[PDB]
Amino acid sequence: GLGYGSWEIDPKDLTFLKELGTGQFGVVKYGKWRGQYDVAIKMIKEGSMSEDEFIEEAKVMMNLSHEKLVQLYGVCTKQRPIFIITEYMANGCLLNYLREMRHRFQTQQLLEMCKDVCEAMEYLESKQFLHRDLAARNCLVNDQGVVKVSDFGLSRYVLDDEYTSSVGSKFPVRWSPPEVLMYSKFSSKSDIWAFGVLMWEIYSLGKMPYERFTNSETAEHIAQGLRLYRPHLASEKVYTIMYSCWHEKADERPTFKILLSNILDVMDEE
Numbered sequence: 001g002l003g004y005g006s007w008e009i010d011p012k013d014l015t016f017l018k019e020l021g022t023g024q025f026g027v028v029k030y031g032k033w034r035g036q037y038d039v040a041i042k043m044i045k046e047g048s049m050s051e052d053e054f055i056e057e058a059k060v061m062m063n064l065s066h067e068k069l070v071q072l073y074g075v076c077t078k079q080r081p082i083f084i085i086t087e088y089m090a091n092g093c094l095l096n097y098l099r100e101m102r103h104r105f106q107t108q109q110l111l112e113m114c115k116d117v118c119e120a121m122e123y124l125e126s127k128q129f130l131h132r133d134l135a136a137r138n139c140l141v142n143d144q145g146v147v148k149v150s151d152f153g154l155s156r157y158v159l160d161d162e163y164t165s166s167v168g169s170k171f172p173v174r175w176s177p178p179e180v181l182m183y184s185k186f187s188s189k190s191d192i193w194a195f196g197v198l199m200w201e202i203y204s205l206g207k208m209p210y211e212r213f214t215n216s217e218t219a220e221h222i223a224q225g226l227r228l229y230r231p232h233l234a235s236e237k238v239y240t241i242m243y244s245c246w247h248e249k250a251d252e253r254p255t256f257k258i259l260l261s262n263i264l265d266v267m268d269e270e
């Protein structure tokens, strides 16, 4: 309506129901839009985000639509704090979900989670859109157990320098290829590397990558050509897939289309 662009949601249409959790931008709540439609409401902590830049990018993100990507519905702007309104994912963050041993996952379920993420990422790749911070902590799980990729591209708007410099205390060292660690070379192939680490997180039931090492030790390990090794729950074929994401030479790493084909092959074989 009148004072709202297509990317803008009227916060007055929101009913707040429950708190879901917190992230690096702050608190996330479950609510309803216009009394009926489930939404997640990300309340963006003051000073945490480059907001004008994010809002311009929201216009682009509005048009990214794929069943395995957490949908952006709009933004509540020109208020303090701003809200990001997204698809509601009732089972919360993938990392926490993996760590709950009650689920007693079959490896077929783990492979399906990898396929869900790979489909989202193949779509993003087809749009030349980098995630830039792919990891289990940035995947969500809905009430049907479907995994979807969340917060794609959002690291570009984070004002905390501890997160954004490869040297920073909060940079995702453990999800980064050598060329990112060494000279900040981001590309489709840094997303591919991260995807490999994510498969490792899934098959490891949410263990931290390089769990015995500091970030500094991890960077040394990786730069010296060494890698994560096979999670107990990963078959030889599944391990081959994740390991292919970690070629020292970025151009030798697969595309998400190729990874998707390889995952489907293993699903048919296993």
Ligand SMILES: NC(=O)c1nnc2ccccc2c1N
Binding pocket: 020, 021, 022, 023, 028, 040, 070, 086, 087, 088, 089, 090, 091, 092, 093, 140
């Ligand atoms: N989109 C969602 O439904 C959602 N988004 N962000 C979260 C952060 C922490 C814990 C849970 C959630 C969550 N369920």
